[PDB]
Write a protein that binds this ligand. Structure first.
Ligand SMILES: [Cl-]
Lengths: 306, 306
């Protein structure tokens, strides 16, 4: 038993992290087969980032201006190109540690593991959720750009996030591995509005189910509700609307606990209207929304990876 | 910026996990050089665990009863021995992926990363604190025994914990890598009392400093305190007494922030007595005690590992 926020084992991704330097700037890149992927703002100086013309900046660069280092091994750059907001550097050696991998663009509310890296060296691993407003609440110091987020399915790494920037509000923004930002953000140093954020309702429900499975049951009540009545309460409290697709995803947990999804919605409704009265659930005094239903099943089943 | 509960990158430990099978029980082992380490209870059946005589049970076994498996390839066991609560299985092949490593016995209040494993395959990684009563609050299903906890200082893996059992209270107990249990626990399926737990005061203080460094600061107050008057309050709320050594350990965070340790204790005193009033520090509605002062410093200067 027990329930923890748990990251994937980071070994397969560790072997892909490299250091990329261009002029004065050093950040992280991802070495897969014979291509290194990194944020295009590696080519910017401090003054550039206020209003960069990335096409004009890149024209000034040649292959030998890019210093790519994997451990102590220096890679030779034989081609460069920009794809949206990511730089793709062709190198003359394929990474022998390349795992089976895919590039995925995840949906808001899905979770992934982040390997935070500095100067191409891994510093730590932790689990993140893509907020409904397409930001993430990470730990990313100066130099962490190019760190990646991923999920592992047995032996396949699905890369879904590359870190690019910190907004003035202290939240974090980045791209998929084809270089397209999540959300409305651009890679320049300006004020940028993130949307109103909202709580990921289906994730809160899944975590209530995990609490029931681990014996935390004080919040179960004698009430039920409807999808429509529940959603009136959700909008009031800045919660995402629950859909039937979400009800279907919660089906397996409903069956393990014998608690119908709309009955668990009734319990969440009462927690939203009445608060928690200074009580805790799974060691938390807030409602937690960074566990997907799949996360909860994996941790209440024992899913393992190659 | 940002502050997260971060585990060490687990790659160096992944390559050491093997599956150990004795007769009919299967758990995890740690393959280091030419030795595999695992919980000695692997040699027990279900009925055995109620009152085991491990010396007698081990006499019934020989080298060929232990099936040690690394991925798909097989180790030859050429010798076995029992060290306290740990089985040492000598194998004829040194693990080619053995990292630089050390066996360490940690202190209550210190932290480490856990690589949760099932059938010798890594499933996830998370950070844990050794509670003052020598339990840990992990996530450990059936088959997770032999999972290990560790820290990394650059290139050296310091193994400090091996998982042995889940207590009837749902908390977790285990040994160092010499096989000595942390706490009063034994490897026997019996009701076992863990002591009263307490909150790790020096860790709560370090986390308050992390909060100030990251911009959460509403809890800084008009007041100061003495070490003695603070401890009077700490005892009331079941916090560990703060000592001068603890003040010294917090010295560097005091110097970065310009907030004397005893002023931060005054902030903690007012939080214990008044609560958080529905405000959150670093996203938490509770006082967090699973970050050590070194953990905070490490995540504010960007320490990496090779
Ligand atoms: Cl957690």
């Amino acid at each position: 038993s027990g329930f923890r926020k748990m990251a994937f084992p980071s070994g397969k991704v560790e072997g892909c992290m490299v250091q990329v330097t261009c002029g004065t700037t050093t950040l992280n890149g991802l070495w897969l087969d014979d291509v290194v992927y990194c944020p295009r703002h590696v080519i910017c100086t401090s003054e550039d980032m206020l209003n960069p013309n990335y096409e004009d900046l890149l024209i000034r660069k040649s292959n030998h201006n890019f210093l790519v280092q994997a451990g102590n091994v220096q890679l030779r750059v034989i081609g460069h190109s920009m794809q949206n907001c990511v730089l793709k550097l062709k190198v003359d050696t394929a990474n022998p540690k390349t795992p089976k991998y895919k590039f995925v663009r995840i949906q808001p509310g899905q979770t992934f593991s982040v390997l935070a890296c500095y100067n191409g060296s891994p510093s730590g691993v932790y689990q993140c959720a893509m907020r409904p407003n397409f930001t993430i609440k990470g730990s990313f110091l100066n130099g962490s750009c190019g760190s990646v987020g991923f999920n592992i399915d047995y032996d396949c790494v699905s890369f879904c996030y590359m870190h690019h920037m910190e907004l003035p509000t202290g939240v974090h923004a980045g791209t998929d591995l084809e270089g397209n930002f999540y959300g409305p953000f651009v890679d320049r140093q300006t004020a940028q509005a993130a949307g109103t954020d909202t709580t990921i309702t289906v994730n809160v429900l899944a975590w209530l189910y995990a609490a029931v499975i681990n014996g935390d049951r004080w919040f179960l009540n004698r009430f039920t509700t409807t999808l429509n009545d529940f959603n009136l309460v959700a909008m009031k409290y800045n919660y995402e609307p629950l859909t039937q697709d979400h009800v279907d995803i919660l089906g397996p947990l409903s069956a393990q606990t014998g608690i119908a999804v709309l009955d668990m919605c009734a319990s969440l409704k009462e927690l939203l209207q009445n608060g928690m009265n200074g009580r805790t659930i799974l060691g938390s005094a807030l409602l937690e929304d960074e566990f997907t239903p799949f996360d909860v099943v994996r941790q209440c089943s024992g899913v393992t990876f190659q």
